[PDB]
Amino acid sequence: PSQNALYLDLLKKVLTNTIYAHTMIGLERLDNLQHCVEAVLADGVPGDFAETGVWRGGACIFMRAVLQAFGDTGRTVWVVDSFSLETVRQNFARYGLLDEQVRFLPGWFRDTLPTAPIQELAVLRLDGDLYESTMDSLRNLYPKLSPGGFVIIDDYFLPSCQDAVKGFRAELGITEPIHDIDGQGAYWRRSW
Ligand SMILES: [Mg+2]
């Protein structure tokens, strides 16, 4: 049961500034994110959503929007970065989604992630340009990812991102198969 499809379709057009830019991830990667979120809602995987490396906040805005479209009032979207914080907050306000289901964690990943007030995740999304940001994010938040939760890495097929993600998976003995999105990003679903 796919609620408010027209709304999310239009929002993806708007976030990518194709109407006449709040995200640069493009439509295919927004599509991916939509399917992943609609899956954890439909399948009842518990947990919040979190993005580390958020740019103008678009992907997090969209995640909040899918919660809106499906009438889920319980889950939180965690917007995690070093920031322009007020600018991001105002981007949420523009779509009318700056509310209690959106939480901000500003700071160096070094300091914030270790102690993050997050208990469990259904979705974990990373814009993994850099080794240390990627490792800080995965090491601290993957353990919070519920069974059936998704991990999405936006820059996966960058060789250096790929090496870092592979190293992390080896460390923890993660073998859930990786899936390509668009030749740039990738994701996998934590086994049940
Ligand atoms: Mg990226």
Side-chain angles (χ1 to χ4, degrees):
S2 188
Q3 312 180 43
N4 289 294
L6 289 169
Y7 168 62
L8 295 177
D9 177 71
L10 175 61
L11 181 57
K12 285 185 296 199
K13 283 170 168 72
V14 176
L15 287 171
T16 58
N17 193 37
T18 59
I19 299 304
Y20 317 111
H22 291 150
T23 189
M24 311 171 305
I25 68 168
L27 286 172
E28 287 206 71
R29 299 222 280 286
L30 283 171
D31 291 343
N32 170 267
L33 178 53
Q34 183 172 346
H35 293 317
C36 285
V37 177
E38 293 185 351
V40 302
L41 299 180
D43 294 341
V45 168
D48 293 334
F49 307 155
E51 197 175 45
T52 59
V54 312
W55 182 235
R56 293 190 152 127
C60 291
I61 289 168
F62 187 65
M63 281 195 287
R64 175 61 186 87
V66 183
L67 295 173
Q68 186 87 325
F70 279 84
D72 189 315
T73 61
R75 312 180 98 109
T76 306
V77 186
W78 298 88
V79 197
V80 183
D81 222 335
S82 82
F83 299 85
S84 61
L85 169 60
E86 179 58 32
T87 304
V88 169
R89 291 181 122 259
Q90 276 298 305
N91 297 347
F92 277 83
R94 293 218 159 73
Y95 303 84
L97 300 168
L98 182 74
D99 54 41
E100 42 271 12
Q101 281 183 268
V102 187
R103 296 277 290 281
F104 297 85
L105 269 188
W108 307 111
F109 300 113
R110 249 55 189 76
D111 315 296
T112 45
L113 285 174
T115 168
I118 312 182
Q119 282 75 312
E120 43 177 12
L121 296 171
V123 180
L124 172 60
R125 195 177 140 92
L126 299 61
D127 287 70
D129 187 18
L130 299 184
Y131 181 94
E132 195 66 28
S133 306
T134 299
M135 297 307 279
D136 287 339
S137 177
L138 286 173
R139 286 175 170 155
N140 284 287
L141 304 175
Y142 187 89
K144 294 168 189 273
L145 189 71
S146 301
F150 292 85
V151 175
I152 312 170
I153 283 80
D154 195 73
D155 305 348
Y156 175 87
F157 283 105
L158 183 65
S160 50
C161 180
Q162 177 163 11
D163 296 348
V165 164
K166 286 172 171 190
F168 172 78
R169 289 164 88 249
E171 280 196 321
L172 276 70
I174 292 171
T175 54
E176 287 88 333
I178 295 182
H179 287 272
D180 176 23
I181 299 167
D182 62 339
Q184 294 191 108
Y187 71 113
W188 78 80
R189 184 174 207 178
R190 188 184 187 143
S191 61
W192 310 97

